[PDB]
Amino acid sequence: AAQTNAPWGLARISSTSPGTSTYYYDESAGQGSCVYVIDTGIEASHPEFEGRAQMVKTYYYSSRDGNGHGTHCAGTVGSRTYGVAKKTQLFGVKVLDDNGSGQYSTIIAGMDFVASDKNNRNCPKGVVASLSLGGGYSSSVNSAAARLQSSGVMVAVAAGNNNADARNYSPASEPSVCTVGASDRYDRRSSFSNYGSVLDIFGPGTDILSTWIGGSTRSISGTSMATPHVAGLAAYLMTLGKTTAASACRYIADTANKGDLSNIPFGTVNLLAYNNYQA
Ligand SMILES: [Ca+2]
């Protein structure tokens, strides 16, 4: 399948070259997979989600996304126009308040929630969790991410936006999950992207168009935007039967475009997420 005039990041993940604008993907499109977006929530009523998104948990007075961040990330995972995996089921878990903040205890509870809640859902092709969030190093936050992964969920987390080594941030520094840095449309490391040996992969993160609250759209930047490209790619590849939740991060790194990014510090992987879709 071909989506013309796609956002650059979608075109990038199905291309061996920067500078194109059509996204190519197998029509299965992540059908039968599930992706949990653990964030500020998701505006499930947005026409872009087509009834495939729902809120499953909140820790605040509402499950509504009063920020936009979670909606934007969920859009990059699975919206009809802005999404990588256009037929996946999206589940929102609101661990972040409408200011985009959340206590680590809440975030930990959200991760353990997903590890259990997947047993209440129909995801025959597999389960992914996208975590576009983080703060300073916490062994308890890393442990929660490690448990979620161990439970059979492909965990993708943002490297962070500090232009620093991700070893000092969580859940970015948990080795057993998939830690995602950000790139731009000219294949440069995004200016704010963290780096370091703990990164597994880069995805598109600078100037990413996606859904927003009030049934709107906008372009924003962050490792928060790179992460859902990878989460959606994993759901897409698991639907194709090419990989599993436990092995998808490794499979994505194995099949990545290699050595194409500029300003990658010595010792950080030079690997850009790629779906290797051949029509
Ligand atoms: Ca890892």
Curated annotation (Swiss-Prot):
Gene Ontology terms, MF aspect: metal ion binding; serine-type endopeptidase activity
GO CC annotations, alphabetized: extracellular region
Residues covered by the Peptidase S8 domain: 7-279
Catalytic residues (UniProt): D39 (charge relay system), H69 (charge relay system), S224 (charge relay system)
Domain of life from the UniProt record: Eukaryota
GO biological process per UniProt: proteolysis
Cysteines joined through disulfide linkages: C34-C123, C178-C249
UniProt-annotated binding residues for Ca(2+) 2: T16, D260
Keywords for this protein: Calcium, Disulfide bond, Hydrolase, Metal-binding, Protease, Serine protease, Signal, Zymogen
EC annotation from Swiss-Prot or TrEMBL: 3.4.21.64
Catalytically driven reaction(s): Hydrolysis of keratin, and of other proteins with subtilisin-like specificity. Hydrolyzes peptide amides
UniProt function note: Hydrolyzes keratin at aromatic and hydrophobic residues.
Family: Belongs to the peptidase S8 family.
Protein's UniProt name: Proteinase K
Natural source organism: Parengyodontium album (Tritirachium album)
Residues of the full protein shown: 106 to 384 of 384
